[PDB]
PDB file of all heavy atoms in Angstrom:
ATOM      1  N   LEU A  41       0.844  -1.210   0.015  1.00  0.00           N
ATOM      2  CA  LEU A  41      -0.018   0.009  -0.013  1.00  0.00           C
ATOM      3  C   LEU A  41       0.891   1.254   0.001  1.00  0.00           C
ATOM      4  O   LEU A  41       1.794   1.357   0.844  1.00  0.00           O
ATOM      5  CB  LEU A  41      -0.841   0.034   1.222  1.00  0.00           C
ATOM      6  CG  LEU A  41      -2.229  -0.675   1.229  1.00  0.00           C
ATOM      7  CD1 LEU A  41      -2.194  -1.955   0.389  1.00  0.00           C
ATOM      8  CD2 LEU A  41      -2.722  -0.983   2.662  1.00  0.00           C
ATOM      9  N   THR A  42       0.634   2.133  -0.947  1.00  0.00           N
ATOM     10  CA  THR A  42       1.330   3.411  -0.989  1.00  0.00           C
ATOM     11  C   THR A  42       0.320   4.548  -0.956  1.00  0.00           C
ATOM     12  O   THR A  42      -0.771   4.390  -1.483  1.00  0.00           O
ATOM     13  CB  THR A  42       2.230   3.593  -2.258  1.00  0.00           C
ATOM     14  OG1 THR A  42       1.428   3.768  -3.431  1.00  0.00           O
ATOM     15  CG2 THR A  42       3.194   2.479  -2.404  1.00  0.00           C
ATOM     16  N   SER A  43       0.727   5.656  -0.372  1.00  0.00           N
ATOM     17  CA  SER A  43      -0.089   6.842  -0.252  1.00  0.00           C
ATOM     18  C   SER A  43       0.786   8.080  -0.510  1.00  0.00           C
ATOM     19  O   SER A  43       1.545   8.424   0.356  1.00  0.00           O
ATOM     20  CB  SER A  43      -0.622   6.917   1.184  1.00  0.00           C
ATOM     21  OG  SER A  43      -1.195   8.209   1.434  1.00  0.00           O
ATOM     22  N   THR A  44       0.715   8.587  -1.738  1.00  0.00           N
ATOM     23  CA  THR A  44       1.545   9.758  -2.067  1.00  0.00           C
ATOM     24  C   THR A  44       0.740  11.067  -2.076  1.00  0.00           C
ATOM     25  O   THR A  44       1.330  12.124  -2.212  1.00  0.00           O
ATOM     26  CB  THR A  44       2.307   9.577  -3.392  1.00  0.00           C
ATOM     27  OG1 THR A  44       1.381   9.676  -4.496  1.00  0.00           O
ATOM     28  CG2 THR A  44       3.022   8.211  -3.459  1.00  0.00           C
ATOM     29  N   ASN A  45      -0.575  11.015  -1.978  1.00  0.00           N
ATOM     30  CA  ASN A  45      -1.379  12.230  -1.824  1.00  0.00           C
ATOM     31  C   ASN A  45      -2.794  12.026  -1.267  1.00  0.00           C
ATOM     32  O   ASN A  45      -3.260  10.880  -1.054  1.00  0.00           O
ATOM     33  CB  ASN A  45      -1.667  12.789  -3.227  1.00  0.00           C
ATOM     34  CG  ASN A  45      -2.539  11.948  -4.076  1.00  0.00           C
ATOM     35  OD1 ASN A  45      -3.357  11.137  -3.580  1.00  0.00           O
ATOM     36  ND2 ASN A  45      -2.430  12.097  -5.429  1.00  0.00           N
ATOM     37  N   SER A  46      -3.480  13.099  -1.024  1.00  0.00           N
ATOM     38  CA  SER A  46      -4.743  13.018  -0.307  1.00  0.00           C
ATOM     39  C   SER A  46      -5.994  12.555  -1.027  1.00  0.00           C
ATOM     40  O   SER A  46      -7.120  12.599  -0.501  1.00  0.00           O
ATOM     41  CB  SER A  46      -4.858  14.428   0.378  1.00  0.00           C
ATOM     42  OG  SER A  46      -5.194  15.415  -0.591  1.00  0.00           O
ATOM     43  N   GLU A  47      -5.792  12.101  -2.300  1.00  0.00           N
ATOM     44  CA  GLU A  47      -6.886  11.647  -3.170  1.00  0.00           C
ATOM     45  C   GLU A  47      -7.087  10.181  -3.268  1.00  0.00           C
ATOM     46  O   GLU A  47      -8.246   9.703  -3.378  1.00  0.00           O
ATOM     47  CB  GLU A  47      -6.551  12.238  -4.529  1.00  0.00           C
ATOM     48  CG  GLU A  47      -7.351  13.485  -4.930  1.00  0.00           C
ATOM     49  CD  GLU A  47      -6.976  14.028  -6.316  1.00  0.00           C
ATOM     50  OE1 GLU A  47      -5.965  13.528  -6.908  1.00  0.00           O
ATOM     51  OE2 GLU A  47      -7.634  14.976  -6.775  1.00  0.00           O
ATOM     52  N   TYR A  48      -5.967   9.441  -3.318  1.00  0.00           N
ATOM     53  CA  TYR A  48      -6.028   7.963  -3.510  1.00  0.00           C
ATOM     54  C   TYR A  48      -4.914   7.212  -2.873  1.00  0.00           C
ATOM     55  O   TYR A  48      -3.833   7.782  -2.499  1.00  0.00           O
ATOM     56  CB  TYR A  48      -6.091   7.625  -5.011  1.00  0.00           C
ATOM     57  CG  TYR A  48      -4.934   8.129  -5.761  1.00  0.00           C
ATOM     58  CD1 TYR A  48      -3.695   7.455  -5.774  1.00  0.00           C
ATOM     59  CD2 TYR A  48      -5.017   9.340  -6.548  1.00  0.00           C
ATOM     60  CE1 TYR A  48      -2.611   7.942  -6.473  1.00  0.00           C
ATOM     61  CE2 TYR A  48      -3.927   9.811  -7.219  1.00  0.00           C
ATOM     62  CZ  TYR A  48      -2.705   9.108  -7.169  1.00  0.00           C
ATOM     63  OH  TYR A  48      -1.691   9.625  -7.935  1.00  0.00           O
ATOM     64  N   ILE A  49      -5.115   5.918  -2.710  1.00  0.00           N
ATOM     65  CA  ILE A  49      -4.056   4.992  -2.277  1.00  0.00           C
ATOM     66  C   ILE A  49      -3.883   3.988  -3.404  1.00  0.00           C
ATOM     67  O   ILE A  49      -4.861   3.650  -4.108  1.00  0.00           O
ATOM     68  CB  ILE A  49      -4.500   4.287  -0.977  1.00  0.00           C
ATOM     69  CG1 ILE A  49      -4.334   5.201   0.213  1.00  0.00           C
ATOM     70  CG2 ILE A  49      -3.723   2.965  -0.769  1.00  0.00           C
ATOM     71  CD1 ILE A  49      -4.964   4.677   1.486  1.00  0.00           C
ATOM     72  N   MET A  50      -2.638   3.514  -3.592  1.00  0.00           N
ATOM     73  CA  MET A  50      -2.353   2.481  -4.573  1.00  0.00           C
ATOM     74  C   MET A  50      -2.195   1.133  -3.886  1.00  0.00           C
ATOM     75  O   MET A  50      -1.553   1.022  -2.815  1.00  0.00           O
ATOM     76  CB  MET A  50      -1.098   2.760  -5.361  1.00  0.00           C
ATOM     77  CG  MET A  50      -1.177   3.895  -6.382  1.00  0.00           C
ATOM     78  SD  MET A  50      -2.546   3.713  -7.621  1.00  0.00           S
ATOM     79  CE  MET A  50      -2.008   2.208  -8.419  1.00  0.00           C
ATOM     80  N   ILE A  51      -2.788   0.092  -4.460  1.00  0.00           N
ATOM     81  CA  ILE A  51      -2.602  -1.225  -3.987  1.00  0.00           C
ATOM     82  C   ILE A  51      -1.726  -2.000  -5.044  1.00  0.00           C
ATOM     83  O   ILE A  51      -2.212  -2.143  -6.199  1.00  0.00           O
ATOM     84  CB  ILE A  51      -3.919  -1.948  -3.811  1.00  0.00           C
ATOM     85  CG1 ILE A  51      -4.870  -1.132  -2.907  1.00  0.00           C
ATOM     86  CG2 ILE A  51      -3.692  -3.321  -3.172  1.00  0.00           C
ATOM     87  CD1 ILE A  51      -6.283  -1.595  -2.947  1.00  0.00           C
ATOM     88  N   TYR A  52      -0.577  -2.475  -4.607  1.00  0.00           N
ATOM     89  CA  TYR A  52       0.247  -3.255  -5.541  1.00  0.00           C
ATOM     90  C   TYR A  52       0.372  -4.698  -5.053  1.00  0.00           C
ATOM     91  O   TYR A  52       0.796  -4.914  -3.883  1.00  0.00           O
ATOM     92  CB  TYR A  52       1.673  -2.681  -5.649  1.00  0.00           C
ATOM     93  CG  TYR A  52       1.717  -1.286  -6.163  1.00  0.00           C
ATOM     94  CD1 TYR A  52       1.971  -0.205  -5.286  1.00  0.00           C
ATOM     95  CD2 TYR A  52       1.478  -0.999  -7.503  1.00  0.00           C
ATOM     96  CE1 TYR A  52       2.059   1.072  -5.749  1.00  0.00           C
ATOM     97  CE2 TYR A  52       1.541   0.272  -7.991  1.00  0.00           C
ATOM     98  CZ  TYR A  52       1.797   1.355  -7.085  1.00  0.00           C
ATOM     99  OH  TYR A  52       1.873   2.627  -7.552  1.00  0.00           O
ATOM    100  N   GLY A  53       0.009  -5.623  -5.912  1.00  0.00           N
ATOM    101  CA  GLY A  53       0.237  -7.065  -5.663  1.00  0.00           C
ATOM    102  C   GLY A  53       1.513  -7.495  -6.344  1.00  0.00           C
ATOM    103  O   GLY A  53       1.516  -7.582  -7.604  1.00  0.00           O
ATOM    104  N   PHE A  54       2.555  -7.741  -5.607  1.00  0.00           N
ATOM    105  CA  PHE A  54       3.838  -8.181  -6.202  1.00  0.00           C
ATOM    106  C   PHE A  54       3.823  -9.624  -6.524  1.00  0.00           C
ATOM    107  O   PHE A  54       3.890 -10.463  -5.651  1.00  0.00           O
ATOM    108  CB  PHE A  54       5.012  -7.924  -5.239  1.00  0.00           C
ATOM    109  CG  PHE A  54       5.496  -6.481  -5.242  1.00  0.00           C
ATOM    110  CD1 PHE A  54       4.760  -5.530  -4.556  1.00  0.00           C
ATOM    111  CD2 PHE A  54       6.588  -6.085  -5.965  1.00  0.00           C
ATOM    112  CE1 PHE A  54       5.158  -4.167  -4.547  1.00  0.00           C
ATOM    113  CE2 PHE A  54       6.999  -4.710  -5.994  1.00  0.00           C
ATOM    114  CZ  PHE A  54       6.247  -3.769  -5.269  1.00  0.00           C
ATOM    115  N   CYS A  55       3.674  -9.908  -7.806  1.00  0.00           N
ATOM    116  CA  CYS A  55       3.495 -11.280  -8.298  1.00  0.00           C
ATOM    117  C   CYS A  55       4.772 -12.058  -8.389  1.00  0.00           C
ATOM    118  O   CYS A  55       4.800 -13.251  -8.123  1.00  0.00           O
ATOM    119  CB  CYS A  55       2.856 -11.233  -9.709  1.00  0.00           C
ATOM    120  SG  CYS A  55       1.213 -10.463  -9.757  1.00  0.00           S
ATOM    121  N   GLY A  56       5.837 -11.385  -8.755  1.00  0.00           N
ATOM    122  CA  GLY A  56       7.167 -12.012  -8.804  1.00  0.00           C
ATOM    123  C   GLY A  56       7.903 -11.628 -10.088  1.00  0.00           C
ATOM    124  O   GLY A  56       7.299 -11.097 -10.985  1.00  0.00           O
ATOM    125  N   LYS A  57       9.224 -11.954 -10.141  1.00  0.00           N
ATOM    126  CA  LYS A  57      10.012 -11.656 -11.295  1.00  0.00           C
ATOM    127  C   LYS A  57       9.614 -12.608 -12.464  1.00  0.00           C
ATOM    128  O   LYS A  57       9.569 -13.808 -12.221  1.00  0.00           O
ATOM    129  CB  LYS A  57      11.531 -11.828 -11.023  1.00  0.00           C
ATOM    130  CG  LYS A  57      12.090 -10.635 -10.216  1.00  0.00           C
ATOM    131  CD  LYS A  57      12.765 -11.012  -8.865  1.00  0.00           C
ATOM    132  CE  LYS A  57      12.614  -9.827  -7.900  1.00  0.00           C
ATOM    133  NZ  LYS A  57      13.370 -10.068  -6.628  1.00  0.00           N
ATOM    134  N   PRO A  58       9.346 -12.088 -13.640  1.00  0.00           N
ATOM    135  CA  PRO A  58       8.993 -13.027 -14.736  1.00  0.00           C
ATOM    136  C   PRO A  58      10.179 -13.487 -15.534  1.00  0.00           C
ATOM    137  O   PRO A  58      11.210 -12.785 -15.516  1.00  0.00           O
ATOM    138  CB  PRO A  58       8.082 -12.177 -15.614  1.00  0.00           C
ATOM    139  CG  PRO A  58       8.513 -10.745 -15.383  1.00  0.00           C
ATOM    140  CD  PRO A  58       9.340 -10.676 -14.117  1.00  0.00           C
ATOM    141  N   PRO A  59      10.147 -14.648 -16.125  1.00  0.00           N
ATOM    142  CA  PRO A  59      11.163 -15.121 -17.064  1.00  0.00           C
ATOM    143  C   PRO A  59      11.347 -13.971 -18.095  1.00  0.00           C
ATOM    144  O   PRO A  59      10.354 -13.504 -18.663  1.00  0.00           O
ATOM    145  CB  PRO A  59      10.512 -16.315 -17.796  1.00  0.00           C
ATOM    146  CG  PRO A  59       9.430 -16.805 -16.925  1.00  0.00           C
ATOM    147  CD  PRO A  59       9.131 -15.708 -15.904  1.00  0.00           C
ATOM    148  N   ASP A  60      12.621 -13.544 -18.362  1.00  0.00           N
ATOM    149  CA  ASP A  60      12.833 -12.477 -19.284  1.00  0.00           C
ATOM    150  C   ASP A  60      12.601 -13.090 -20.674  1.00  0.00           C
ATOM    151  O   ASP A  60      13.500 -13.762 -21.239  1.00  0.00           O
ATOM    152  CB  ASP A  60      14.171 -11.746 -19.066  1.00  0.00           C
ATOM    153  CG  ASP A  60      14.106 -10.853 -17.786  1.00  0.00           C
ATOM    154  OD1 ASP A  60      13.024 -10.245 -17.476  1.00  0.00           O
ATOM    155  OD2 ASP A  60      15.152 -10.792 -17.072  1.00  0.00           O
ATOM    156  N   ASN A  61      11.399 -12.898 -21.145  1.00  0.00           N
ATOM    157  CA  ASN A  61      10.892 -13.464 -22.363  1.00  0.00           C
ATOM    158  C   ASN A  61       9.932 -12.453 -22.992  1.00  0.00           C
ATOM    159  O   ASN A  61       8.800 -12.305 -22.531  1.00  0.00           O
ATOM    160  CB  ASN A  61      10.172 -14.818 -22.164  1.00  0.00           C
ATOM    161  CG  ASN A  61       9.759 -15.463 -23.470  1.00  0.00           C
ATOM    162  OD1 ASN A  61      10.434 -15.378 -24.499  1.00  0.00           O
ATOM    163  ND2 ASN A  61       8.622 -16.146 -23.438  1.00  0.00           N
ATOM    164  N   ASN A  62      10.421 -11.767 -23.988  1.00  0.00           N
ATOM    165  CA  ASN A  62       9.711 -10.700 -24.675  1.00  0.00           C
ATOM    166  C   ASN A  62       8.358 -11.128 -25.232  1.00  0.00           C
ATOM    167  O   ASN A  62       7.419 -10.308 -25.335  1.00  0.00           O
ATOM    168  CB  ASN A  62      10.546 -10.075 -25.792  1.00  0.00           C
ATOM    169  CG  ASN A  62      10.103  -8.648 -26.156  1.00  0.00           C
ATOM    170  OD1 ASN A  62       9.884  -7.803 -25.237  1.00  0.00           O
ATOM    171  ND2 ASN A  62      10.008  -8.331 -27.430  1.00  0.00           N
ATOM    172  N   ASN A  63       8.195 -12.401 -25.553  1.00  0.00           N
ATOM    173  CA  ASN A  63       7.001 -12.926 -26.109  1.00  0.00           C
ATOM    174  C   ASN A  63       5.915 -13.247 -25.054  1.00  0.00           C
ATOM    175  O   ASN A  63       4.748 -12.884 -25.209  1.00  0.00           O
ATOM    176  CB  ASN A  63       7.255 -14.174 -27.006  1.00  0.00           C
ATOM    177  CG  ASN A  63       7.856 -13.753 -28.335  1.00  0.00           C
ATOM    178  OD1 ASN A  63       7.458 -12.768 -28.929  1.00  0.00           O
ATOM    179  ND2 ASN A  63       8.798 -14.560 -28.834  1.00  0.00           N
ATOM    180  N   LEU A  64       6.340 -13.811 -23.923  1.00  0.00           N
ATOM    181  CA  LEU A  64       5.524 -14.066 -22.761  1.00  0.00           C
ATOM    182  C   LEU A  64       4.935 -12.745 -22.223  1.00  0.00           C
ATOM    183  O   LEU A  64       3.801 -12.684 -21.737  1.00  0.00           O
ATOM    184  CB  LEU A  64       6.379 -14.757 -21.714  1.00  0.00           C
ATOM    185  CG  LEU A  64       5.629 -15.165 -20.432  1.00  0.00           C
ATOM    186  CD1 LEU A  64       5.248 -16.654 -20.548  1.00  0.00           C
ATOM    187  CD2 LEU A  64       6.535 -14.955 -19.188  1.00  0.00           C
ATOM    188  N   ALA A  65       5.758 -11.634 -22.295  1.00  0.00           N
ATOM    189  CA  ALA A  65       5.326 -10.313 -21.941  1.00  0.00           C
ATOM    190  C   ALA A  65       4.139  -9.828 -22.777  1.00  0.00           C
ATOM    191  O   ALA A  65       3.280  -9.133 -22.263  1.00  0.00           O
ATOM    192  CB  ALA A  65       6.460  -9.370 -21.995  1.00  0.00           C
ATOM    193  N   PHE A  66       4.112 -10.188 -24.075  1.00  0.00           N
ATOM    194  CA  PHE A  66       3.006  -9.933 -24.952  1.00  0.00           C
ATOM    195  C   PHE A  66       1.722 -10.640 -24.501  1.00  0.00           C
ATOM    196  O   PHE A  66       0.636 -10.170 -24.750  1.00  0.00           O
ATOM    197  CB  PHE A  66       3.325 -10.165 -26.450  1.00  0.00           C
ATOM    198  CG  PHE A  66       3.877  -8.969 -27.160  1.00  0.00           C
ATOM    199  CD1 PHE A  66       5.192  -8.899 -27.651  1.00  0.00           C
ATOM    200  CD2 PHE A  66       3.063  -7.845 -27.420  1.00  0.00           C
ATOM    201  CE1 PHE A  66       5.698  -7.804 -28.286  1.00  0.00           C
ATOM    202  CE2 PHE A  66       3.539  -6.736 -28.067  1.00  0.00           C
ATOM    203  CZ  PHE A  66       4.876  -6.701 -28.504  1.00  0.00           C
ATOM    204  N   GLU A  67       1.843 -11.800 -23.829  1.00  0.00           N
ATOM    205  CA  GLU A  67       0.712 -12.457 -23.196  1.00  0.00           C
ATOM    206  C   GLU A  67       0.276 -11.776 -21.916  1.00  0.00           C
ATOM    207  O   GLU A  67      -0.948 -11.772 -21.570  1.00  0.00           O
ATOM    208  CB  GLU A  67       0.913 -13.979 -22.948  1.00  0.00           C
ATOM    209  CG  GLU A  67      -0.286 -14.734 -22.341  1.00  0.00           C
ATOM    210  CD  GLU A  67      -1.274 -15.181 -23.398  1.00  0.00           C
ATOM    211  OE1 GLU A  67      -1.003 -14.966 -24.649  1.00  0.00           O
ATOM    212  OE2 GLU A  67      -2.272 -15.834 -23.043  1.00  0.00           O
ATOM    213  N   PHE A  68       1.214 -11.169 -21.158  1.00  0.00           N
ATOM    214  CA  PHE A  68       0.853 -10.364 -20.016  1.00  0.00           C
ATOM    215  C   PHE A  68      -0.021  -9.167 -20.478  1.00  0.00           C
ATOM    216  O   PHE A  68      -1.041  -8.900 -19.917  1.00  0.00           O
ATOM    217  CB  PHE A  68       2.035  -9.880 -19.240  1.00  0.00           C
ATOM    218  CG  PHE A  68       2.846 -11.010 -18.579  1.00  0.00           C
ATOM    219  CD1 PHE A  68       4.224 -10.923 -18.464  1.00  0.00           C
ATOM    220  CD2 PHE A  68       2.176 -12.099 -18.060  1.00  0.00           C
ATOM    221  CE1 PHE A  68       4.983 -11.888 -17.856  1.00  0.00           C
ATOM    222  CE2 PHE A  68       2.912 -13.136 -17.425  1.00  0.00           C
ATOM    223  CZ  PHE A  68       4.317 -13.030 -17.340  1.00  0.00           C
ATOM    224  N   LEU A  69       0.434  -8.530 -21.568  1.00  0.00           N
ATOM    225  CA  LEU A  69      -0.334  -7.427 -22.126  1.00  0.00           C
ATOM    226  C   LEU A  69      -1.682  -7.823 -22.669  1.00  0.00           C
ATOM    227  O   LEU A  69      -2.641  -7.124 -22.462  1.00  0.00           O
ATOM    228  CB  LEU A  69       0.438  -6.778 -23.262  1.00  0.00           C
ATOM    229  CG  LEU A  69       1.526  -5.749 -22.857  1.00  0.00           C
ATOM    230  CD1 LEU A  69       2.339  -5.406 -24.054  1.00  0.00           C
ATOM    231  CD2 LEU A  69       0.895  -4.511 -22.212  1.00  0.00           C
ATOM    232  N   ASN A  70      -1.669  -8.919 -23.338  1.00  0.00           N
ATOM    233  CA  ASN A  70      -2.934  -9.530 -23.789  1.00  0.00           C
ATOM    234  C   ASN A  70      -3.925  -9.869 -22.658  1.00  0.00           C
ATOM    235  O   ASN A  70      -5.125  -9.752 -22.813  1.00  0.00           O
ATOM    236  CB  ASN A  70      -2.683 -10.722 -24.645  1.00  0.00           C
ATOM    237  CG  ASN A  70      -3.928 -11.470 -25.075  1.00  0.00           C
ATOM    238  OD1 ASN A  70      -4.678 -10.958 -25.973  1.00  0.00           O
ATOM    239  ND2 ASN A  70      -4.172 -12.600 -24.517  1.00  0.00           N
ATOM    240  N   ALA A  71      -3.391 -10.299 -21.516  1.00  0.00           N
ATOM    241  CA  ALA A  71      -4.274 -10.606 -20.388  1.00  0.00           C
ATOM    242  C   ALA A  71      -4.935  -9.340 -19.763  1.00  0.00           C
ATOM    243  O   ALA A  71      -6.039  -9.474 -19.099  1.00  0.00           O
ATOM    244  CB  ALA A  71      -3.418 -11.298 -19.261  1.00  0.00           C
ATOM    245  N   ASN A  72      -4.357  -8.189 -19.992  1.00  0.00           N
ATOM    246  CA  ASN A  72      -4.961  -6.932 -19.563  1.00  0.00           C
ATOM    247  C   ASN A  72      -6.345  -6.678 -20.174  1.00  0.00           C
ATOM    248  O   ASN A  72      -7.144  -5.972 -19.628  1.00  0.00           O
ATOM    249  CB  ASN A  72      -4.071  -5.769 -19.802  1.00  0.00           C
ATOM    250  CG  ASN A  72      -3.111  -5.526 -18.623  1.00  0.00           C
ATOM    251  OD1 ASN A  72      -3.551  -5.255 -17.510  1.00  0.00           O
ATOM    252  ND2 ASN A  72      -1.823  -5.598 -18.889  1.00  0.00           N
ATOM    253  N   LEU A  73      -6.622  -7.343 -21.304  1.00  0.00           N
ATOM    254  CA  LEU A  73      -7.987  -7.350 -21.864  1.00  0.00           C
ATOM    255  C   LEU A  73      -9.019  -7.938 -20.940  1.00  0.00           C
ATOM    256  O   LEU A  73     -10.111  -7.372 -20.761  1.00  0.00           O
ATOM    257  CB  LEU A  73      -8.043  -8.059 -23.193  1.00  0.00           C
ATOM    258  CG  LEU A  73      -7.280  -7.421 -24.360  1.00  0.00           C
ATOM    259  CD1 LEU A  73      -7.094  -8.424 -25.451  1.00  0.00           C
ATOM    260  CD2 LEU A  73      -8.004  -6.202 -24.862  1.00  0.00           C
ATOM    261  N   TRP A  74      -8.660  -9.042 -20.295  1.00  0.00           N
ATOM    262  CA  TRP A  74      -9.584  -9.735 -19.333  1.00  0.00           C
ATOM    263  C   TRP A  74      -9.735  -8.953 -18.069  1.00  0.00           C
ATOM    264  O   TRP A  74     -10.799  -8.802 -17.525  1.00  0.00           O
ATOM    265  CB  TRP A  74      -9.115 -11.138 -19.023  1.00  0.00           C
ATOM    266  CG  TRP A  74     -10.040 -11.986 -18.138  1.00  0.00           C
ATOM    267  CD1 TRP A  74     -11.080 -12.757 -18.575  1.00  0.00           C
ATOM    268  CD2 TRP A  74      -9.982 -12.151 -16.722  1.00  0.00           C
ATOM    269  NE1 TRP A  74     -11.684 -13.380 -17.505  1.00  0.00           N
ATOM    270  CE2 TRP A  74     -11.031 -13.020 -16.353  1.00  0.00           C
ATOM    271  CE3 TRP A  74      -9.145 -11.601 -15.738  1.00  0.00           C
ATOM    272  CZ2 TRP A  74     -11.238 -13.372 -15.035  1.00  0.00           C
ATOM    273  CZ3 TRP A  74      -9.384 -11.991 -14.419  1.00  0.00           C
ATOM    274  CH2 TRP A  74     -10.417 -12.848 -14.086  1.00  0.00           C
ATOM    275  N   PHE A  75      -8.601  -8.420 -17.540  1.00  0.00           N
ATOM    276  CA  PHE A  75      -8.643  -7.601 -16.339  1.00  0.00           C
ATOM    277  C   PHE A  75      -9.434  -6.335 -16.562  1.00  0.00           C
ATOM    278  O   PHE A  75     -10.164  -5.844 -15.676  1.00  0.00           O
ATOM    279  CB  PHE A  75      -7.277  -7.223 -15.873  1.00  0.00           C
ATOM    280  CG  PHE A  75      -6.524  -8.361 -15.228  1.00  0.00           C
ATOM    281  CD1 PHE A  75      -5.215  -8.619 -15.604  1.00  0.00           C
ATOM    282  CD2 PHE A  75      -7.044  -9.042 -14.156  1.00  0.00           C
ATOM    283  CE1 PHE A  75      -4.499  -9.652 -14.966  1.00  0.00           C
ATOM    284  CE2 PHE A  75      -6.395 -10.059 -13.548  1.00  0.00           C
ATOM    285  CZ  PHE A  75      -5.113 -10.396 -13.964  1.00  0.00           C
ATOM    286  N   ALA A  76      -9.304  -5.695 -17.769  1.00  0.00           N
ATOM    287  CA  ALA A  76     -10.067  -4.539 -18.125  1.00  0.00           C
ATOM    288  C   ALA A  76     -11.550  -4.817 -18.146  1.00  0.00           C
ATOM    289  O   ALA A  76     -12.355  -4.063 -17.621  1.00  0.00           O
ATOM    290  CB  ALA A  76      -9.562  -3.957 -19.428  1.00  0.00           C
ATOM    291  N   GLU A  77     -11.958  -5.888 -18.823  1.00  0.00           N
ATOM    292  CA  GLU A  77     -13.353  -6.273 -18.947  1.00  0.00           C
ATOM    293  C   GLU A  77     -13.995  -6.506 -17.581  1.00  0.00           C
ATOM    294  O   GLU A  77     -15.157  -6.198 -17.412  1.00  0.00           O
ATOM    295  CB  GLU A  77     -13.516  -7.464 -19.842  1.00  0.00           C
ATOM    296  CG  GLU A  77     -14.992  -7.639 -20.216  1.00  0.00           C
ATOM    297  CD  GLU A  77     -15.157  -8.200 -21.642  1.00  0.00           C
ATOM    298  OE1 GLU A  77     -14.131  -8.475 -22.326  1.00  0.00           O
ATOM    299  OE2 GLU A  77     -16.319  -8.391 -22.078  1.00  0.00           O
TER     300      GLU A  77
END
């Protein structure tokens, strides 16, 4: 939990270091479609 101003707080879930794989990262980006929906 971070609080840098009087309007909002940020919640960060630290998932872990990913395999440095530029293609797998494109699936992380693609998964943002489901999280957005």
